[PDB]
Structure formats: structure tokens, C-alpha cells
Design a protein around this ligand. Structure first.
Ligand SMILES: *[C@@H]1O[C@H](CO)[C@@H](O[C@@H]2O[C@H](CO)[C@@H](O[C@@H]3O[C@H](CO[C@H]4O[C@H](CO)[C@@H](O)[C@H](O)[C@@H]4O[C@@H]4O[C@H](CO)[C@@H](O)[C@H](O)[C@H]4NC(C)=O)[C@@H](O)[C@H](O[C@H]4O[C@H](CO)[C@@H](O)[C@H](O)[C@@H]4O[C@@H]4O[C@H](CO)[C@@H](O)[C@H](O)[C@H]4NC(C)=O)[C@@H]3O)[C@H](O)[C@H]2NC(C)=O)[C@H](O)[C@H]1NC(C)=O
Ligand SMILES: OC[C@H]1O[C@@](CO)(O[C@H]2O[C@H](CO)[C@@H](O)[C@H](O)[C@H]2O)[C@@H](O)[C@@H]1O
Ligand SMILES: OC[C@H]1O[C@@](CO)(O[C@H]2O[C@H](CO)[C@@H](O)[C@H](O)[C@H]2O)[C@@H](O)[C@@H]1O
Ligand SMILES: Cn1c(=O)c2c(ncn2C)n(C)c1=O
Lengths: 423, 218
């Protein structure tokens, strides 16, 4: 439970002094040096000095040895840093950090930082100006100019508009006041229909302003094969295929999300040149059997230099109460017995969703001479299909048993079968 | 003093990749079996966090994927497989003697496909012009990589000293940058010229992109 808690924001005038404190707890204060380090805006770390809390002995950086005083109050286990004659370039975050006195193993624990701003400015609320133009995407914004101190927060349409919003970090101007811009990109078609309002809040001056501001690659996302999601032995995969990738922009990029969370285990295949002077590129995300069956959404986001914005595509298993297939095998018509080959039928019906696998076998070996119809929607919301196996009439007359096997999530063990034979 | 140089200033990689960060001291930081060289991670708005101490020792609680190595003047920090949480700034620091010094930092950034900026120019408002000022805003939106140049031309005359830039942090959803440049003038100086142009250069643009408007024709 080691803690280093520093004092809060400091806004000071040039020539004045600041004193930052660093409250220590959860360790023996005596066993560690307390160091001070500063970071100027957009700059690196700079060591200022260190104090020994047992004897009060100090070490300084020559740049700070004549303007900084380090003291420790062992009663309140607090370390202090007094910086005098403040200059404008003393604006920075000041950190206290501990170092083991006994053996040097780095700055193992740092305080949260204390922002010190050196400025001749006094509290001032911003002026809010619209940023509107004098193309499928339009840009609009708000110029929030001349405010002091930081920060200002900007929202759009009271938080309804969050996508495409960039609130820029503030710039300190020559005048000593801050200024920033907030922009939003929107479909040009909306400009007539929709309104855009920026909500500016500057808590230090209690100011609140609400200002009204007035052909390429294609992606196909494929689900897993139905047998794959139902058998733990097989591997189910979602497949993203991008076609019409220019010869000028081979830039192969995919991002994958499962219920909006990014995953990094997809495997991108090597780029394939097509007979129409374009590339074709596929990415394959392996999925968890139960994640596909629980209704998780798999999103594929494609990025390319030839795409003004990314192409997103989503795919999930169909929603609705899973319903179990009913399997009925129907023998060949007596009118078909005047032929060298006969048709064994398998009716699969009343199932939902439509993802199913149907096969045929005899004597524990696959019968591959069949065709299955695609599923067809019924008036009750469930699907049906027929599978037709072509057998030599000879095979059927000898009393050989044929089996129509069905695999569907709603079945127990995801599997059922119906046999068929000549009586 | 001992000066530490970190390279590269920016490292562009993907989650899952091996990151290798370099730190080189102007004078040796090793004595008597140890190298007094330590590594920290800093996330925006957060205090640094000790990762590696004494060149190769893992600080207690830091994940196993962090490892340090080297001696004398050349040091390396390796992240065996980047996690989304590792895209941050990394600093080296020595303690061979005083003054204690840090390197300039290395930004580990998310790599992505090149994306050219959408450039927009915004003339000053009639509201701002009632006061004696004119701010012309240029927006470069959703581009990658971070590098970009923006120049202002007022009647084909190149400007300098009267503009300020501001860049956003890499976007959490699309890994891009956005930038704004603001040319500031007095109303008197704004009324002296008519063509206000924003010229942008970026890796994603085969030639510079210039957006402009004619003062008064808006
Ligand atoms: C240059 O040359 C290229 C190669 O010849 C050529 O690529 C072809 O481009 C077309 C589009 O222009 C693309 O067509 C789509 O195909 C989808 C089905 O593709 C299957 O099947 C075909 C054979 O029929 C195969 O050739 C494909 O490779 C692909 O095979 C599947 O691949 C996966 C993964 O590898 C396997 O797991 C599968 O088992 C395998 N299946 C099979 C049967 O083998 C088809 O679904 C697409 O239709 C949808 O979009 C159309 C508009 O583009 C709509 O009209 C249509 O209604 C569909 O709309 C969808 O509807 C859903 C709701 O029902 C929505 O949720 C969707 O959002 C909606 N989509 C959209 C976009 O709105 C479509 O026809 C070819 O597949 C592709 N060929 C290959 C080999 O990649 C380039 O176009 C050529 N370019 C030029 C300039 O000429
Ligand atoms: O071994 C780590 C990691 O390497 C991968 C990268 O695709 O492939 C390796 O193993 C394959 C055999 O499974 C080899 O054919 C291939 O050359 C080798 O790089 C991953 O499969 C694996 O997780
Ligand atoms: O991690 C410490 C130390 O362990 C070694 C073996 O001595 O590597 C092992 O641990 C790694 C991290 O868990 C594994 O990736 C590796 O496969 C395993 O051998 C050293 O390389 C390392 O310094
Ligand atoms: C500095 N140091 C350590 O900090 C260390 C160690 N073994 C364990 N630790 C933590 N050894 C051998 C070591 O020299």
C-alpha cells in the first residue's frame, strides 16, 4: 500500500513562488530518498533534485540548485519542493518520486503529478465562434478562443453526436490565454436535414455556451460452415474477403471484433492477383463453437489507402428460438421402379435457424451421390428441405439400409438419423 | 553530464509484435558488475511507471513480456509481444553519476495503412470580425502517419510566425491523427488581402493539397 500523494493544480504569476508537497504513506520514509522531476508541455523528463529525509542532505541539478529548496517534515511524512522567482518556462508537471536509499533500483514509485502554470493572466471565459465552410463528407466546428485557466470541455448535440468528433488540445497564445477548436465530420447530405450544436463548458469562469453551427474495394463476410460449429473436432471460422483492391494500393488491413471487443488471432492470407487487374485478399477468424451458437457478433473492419473510410461488415447467427428438425425418410415411388436408378428422399422440417448439415450413408461409409435443396421458409417461421439420394435399383432391392443423417444445434448431441430400407 | 539518446523517436507496430527500444549513453553507465540504467513507461496524463531497473531486472509487478539488456553505453528494452495497453511512451534513465538524466523518450504507436488527410479551410466568423481579430482555421482530418506539413499563403505569400498547430492523440477506434492550424491576424491586416490558402503535404498525397477561399466572397 505504498502511496505518494501530491498537492493540486497551481496557477501562479511570473516572479512568484510555488511549493508542492508530496504526502508519503505505507512505508518507512527514512529508508528512501525523495526525488523531484519535471515535465514541460510535450517534453521529456528532467531531474531537479533529491533530499535525504533522515539528515536533510540534498543533491541538485545545476540548472535548479539556486532556485529550489527541498525540505521534509518527518512528523507528517511529507516532502516539499519550493521553486522561487517563477519564469514562464517553469510551466510543467512536477513529480516527486522515491528511490531506495540502501540500493539504487530506480524511481520505483512516483506521485500523480502537480501541474504548475506560470501566467500573468486572470480567470477569463472563452468566446465561442462557429467553424463553417465558405464532396460526400462535410466538416464543421467551434473555435473556443481566449480563455484562462484550463480546461474547457466540448460536446456536440448534448452528447448525441460523438462519432467523428475531435476536440483539439489547447494552445497557449502570445497573450497568455488558451484557445482551442472542436470539429466534427458529417455526411454532406445531412447539412439540410440535421442541426449541429457545440456545448462549451469552462468551469473556472462558470461559462456555458451552446452555439449552433450553420468503384473502390468491396467486402464480403461469410459465416462458419454449419457442421463446424456443431462438432468440437472441427474448426468453425468466419471469413472476410475484400475484392477490387487497386493495383496502386495493395495495403492489406483487417481489424476483428467479437461483441465490439477487438481480437488479434485472425490469419490474413497472402494477396492474390485477379484476371481483372485487381487483388483479392482474405482474413480468417477462427471462432469458439459456443460463441457462434450464443449469438456473438463477428465484425470485420477493412482498411486500405484506396478507401476514404473503413468498410465494416458484421455477421451473427440468426436470432429467434431454436427449433428442432423433424426427419422423415420416404421410399422410391413404385412408378420409378422401371429404371436402373431410384430416388431415396429425406424430408427435414420444422427447424430454426436455417443452418443445418444433411448427409447420407450406408453400412458406415458415406453415400456421396445426393443433392439437397436449400432451406425454404414455412408460414410458421421454421424451415424445411428435402435431400435426394440416387441409388442403383439393384442396391435397394437387396435390402441394403440407407441413412439420412442430420446435424443441427437444436438436436440433442447436435445429431439425428433416419434409416431407409425395402420391407 | 551523461546524455542518453533513445531511438527511434517513434516505433510503429501492431498488437502481438516484438518491440525493441534502444538507449545509448554518451559515456558508460556500468561499474562493478552493474549498469545504472532504468526504464519507465508513461501514458498520457499519468506518472511514469518503473519497468526495468539496473539494465535487466524486472520491477516487481511488471509483466514478464518486459525485459532489458545491454551494458556500458548501449541498452535495449524488449516487449516480447505487444498488448494494447503497451502503446505508450518509454524513457530510459541513468544513475551512474550526477546529474541524473533521462532519454528523450520513444513513442510506441499503433501501425496502420496510410490514410491521406481530408483538408478543410474555415474563414473567420462575422462575430469574431466585430472585434479586431480574424482566425482562419485549417483542419487535416483522420490521417496516418502523424507526419504532415501545413503552410499558409495569403495572396501566394508564404506566412510564418502568425500560426499555431495542435494535434490529437492517436484515435482509439481508427488509429489516425487529426491536426488543426490556425492563422491569426488583425481585422486591419485581414482586410488588406483576399486569397487565404492552406497548402498541406503528407505521404498519402502524391502532390500538395491546397484549400482556399476569397475574403468577401463567402
Ligand atoms: C474481379 O474479379 C473478382 C473475381 O472473379 C471479382 O470478385 C467477385 O466480386 C463479386 C462482387 O462484385 C462477389 O459477389 C458476392 O458473392 C457473394 C457470394 O460469394 C461466394 O460465392 C461465389 C460463387 O457464387 C464465389 O465465387 C465466392 O468466392 C464466394 O464463395 C464463398 O467463399 C467463402 C469464403 O472463402 C466460403 O466459406 C463459401 O463456402 C463460398 N461459397 C460458395 C457458394 O462457394 C454474395 O453473397 C454477394 O451477394 C451480396 O451482395 C450483392 C451485391 O454485391 C447483393 O446483390 C446480394 O443480395 C448480397 O447482398 C447481401 O445481403 C445480405 C442479406 O441477405 C446483407 O447482410 C449483405 O450486407 C449484402 N451485401 C452487400 C454487399 O450489400 C455477392 O454477389 C464475388 O463473390 C467475388 N468473387 C470472388 C471469387 O471473390 C471482382 O468483383 C471483379 N471485379 C471487377 C471490377 O470486375
Ligand atoms: O511457432 C510460432 C508460430 O509460428 C507460426 C507462424 O505462422 O508458424 C510456424 O509453425 C508452422 C507449423 O505449424 C510452420 O509451418 C511455420 O513455418 C512456422 O513459422 C504459427 O503457426 C505458430 O504459432
Ligand atoms: O523468463 C525468465 C527467463 O526464462 C527463460 C528460460 O530460462 O525463458 C522461459 O520463459 C519465457 C517466459 O515465460 C518463455 O517464453 C520461454 O519459452 C521459456 O524458456 C529465459 O529466456 C528468460 O530470461
Ligand atoms: C540486482 N539484483 C536483483 O535485483 C535481483 C537479483 N536476484 C533477484 N533480484 C530481484 N540479483 C542477483 C541482483 O543482482
Amino acid at each position: 500500500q505504498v502511496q505518494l500523494v501530491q498537492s493540486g493544480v497551481e496557477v501562479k504569476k511570473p516572479g512568484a513562488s510555488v511549493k508542492v508537497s508530496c504526502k508519503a504513506s505505507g512505508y518507512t520514509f527514512t529508508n528512501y530518498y525523495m526525488y523531484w522531476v519535471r515535465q514541460a508541455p510535450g517534453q521529456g523528463l528532467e531531474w531537479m533534485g533529491g533530499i535525504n529525509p533522515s539528515n536533510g542532505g540534498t543533491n541538485f541539478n545545476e540548472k535548479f540548485k539556486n532556485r529550489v529548496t527541498l525540505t521534509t517534515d518527518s512528523s507528517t511524512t511529507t516532502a516539499y519542493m519550493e521553486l522561487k522567482s517563477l519564469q514562464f518556462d517553469d510551466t510543467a508537471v512536477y513529480y516527486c518520486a522515491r528511490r531506495d536509499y540502501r540500493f539504487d533500483m530506480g524511481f520505483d514509485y512516483w506521485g500523480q503529478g502537480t501541474t504548475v502554470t506560470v501566467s500573468s493572466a486572470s480567470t477569463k471565459g472563452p468566446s465561442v465562434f462557429p467553424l463553417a465552410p465558405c464532396e460526400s463528407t462535410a466538416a464543421l466546428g467551434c473555435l473556443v478562443k481566449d480563455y484562462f485557466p484550463e480546461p474547457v470541455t466540448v460536446s456536440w448535440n448534448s452528447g448525441a453526436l460523438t462519432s467523428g468528433v475531435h476536440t483539439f488540445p489547447a494552445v497557449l497564445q502570445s497573450s497568455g490565454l488558451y484557445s482551442l477548436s472542436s470539429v466534427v465530420t458529417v455526411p454532406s447530405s445531412s447539412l439540410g436535414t440535421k442541426t449541429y450544436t457545440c456545448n462549451v463548458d469552462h468551469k473556472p469562469s462558470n461559462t456555458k455556451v451552446d452555439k449552433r453551427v450553420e468503384g473502390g474495394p468491396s467486402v464480403f463476410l461469410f459465416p462458419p460452415k454449419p457442421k463446424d460449429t456443431l462438432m468440437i473436432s472441427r474448426t468453425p471460422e468466419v471469413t472476410c474477403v475484400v475484392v477490387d483492391v487497386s493495383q496502386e494500393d495493395p495495403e492489406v488491413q483487417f481489424n476483428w471484433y467479437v461483441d465490439g471487443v477487438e481480437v488479434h488471432n485472425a490469419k490474413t492470407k497472402p494477396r492474390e492477383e485477379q484476371f481483372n487487374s485487381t487483388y483479392r485478399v482474405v482474413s480468417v477468424l477462427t471462432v469458439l463453437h459456443q460463441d457462434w451458437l450464443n449469438g456473438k457478433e463477428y465484425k470485420c473492419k477493412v482498411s486500405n489507402k484506396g478507401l476514404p473510410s473503413s468498410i465494416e461488415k458484421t455477421i451473427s447467427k440468426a436470432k429467434g428460438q431454436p427449433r428442432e428438425p423433424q426427419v422423415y425418410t420416404l421410399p422410391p415411388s413404385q412408378e420409378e421402379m422401371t429404371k436402373n436408378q431410384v430416388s431415396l428422399t429425406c424430408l427435414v422440417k420444422g427447424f430454426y435457424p436455417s443452418d443445418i448439415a444433411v448427409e447420407w450413408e450406408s453400412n458406415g461409409q458415406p453415400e456421396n451421390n445426393y443433392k439437397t435443396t436449400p432451406p425454404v421458409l414455412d408460414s410458421d417461421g421454421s424451415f424445411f428441405l428435402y435431400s435426394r439420394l440416387t441409388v442403383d435399383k439393384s442396391r435397394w432391392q437387396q435390402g441394403n439400409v440407407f441413412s439420412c443423417s442430420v446435424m443441427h444445434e437444436a438436436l440433442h448431441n447436435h445429431y439425428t438419423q433416419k434409416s431407409l430400407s425395402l420391407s | 553530464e551523461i546524455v542518453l539518446t533513445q531511438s527511434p523517436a517513434t516505433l510503429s507496430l501492431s498488437p502481438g509484435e516484438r518491440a525493441t527500444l534502444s538507449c545509448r549513453a554518451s559515456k558508460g553507465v556500468s561499474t562493478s558488475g552493474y549498469s545504472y540504467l532504468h526504464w519507465y513507461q508513461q501514458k498520457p496524463g499519468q506518472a511514469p511507471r518503473l519497468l526495468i531497473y539496473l539494465a535487466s531486472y524486472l520491477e516487481s509487478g511488471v509483466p514478464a513480456r518486459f525485459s532489458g539488456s545491454g551494458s556500458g553505453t548501449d541498452f535495449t528494452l524488449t516487449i516480447s509481444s505487444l498488448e494494447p495497453e503497451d502503446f505508450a511512451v518509454y524513457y530510459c534513465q541513468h544513475s551512474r553519476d550526477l546529474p541524473l538524466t533521462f532519454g528523450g523518450g520513444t513513442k510506441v504507436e499503433i501501425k496502420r495503412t496510410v490514410a491521406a488527410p481530408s483538408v478543410f479551410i474555415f474563414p473567420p466568423s462575422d462575430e469574431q470580425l466585430k472585434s479586431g481579430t480574424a482566425s482562419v482555421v485549417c483542419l487535416l482530418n483522420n490521417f496516418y502517419p502523424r507526419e504532415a506539413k501545413v503552410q499558409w499563403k495569403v495572396d501566394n505569400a508564404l506566412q510564418s510566425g502568425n500560426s499555431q498547430e495542435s494535434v490529437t492523440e492517436q484515435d482509439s477506434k481508427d488509429s489516425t491523427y487529426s491536426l488543426s492550424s490556425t492563422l491569426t491576424l488583425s481585422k486591419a491586416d485581414y482586410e488588406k488581402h483576399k486569397v487565404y490558402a492552406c497548402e498541406v503535404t503528407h505521404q498519402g498525397l502524391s502532390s500538395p493539397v491546397t484549400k482556399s477561399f476569397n475574403r468577401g466572397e463567402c
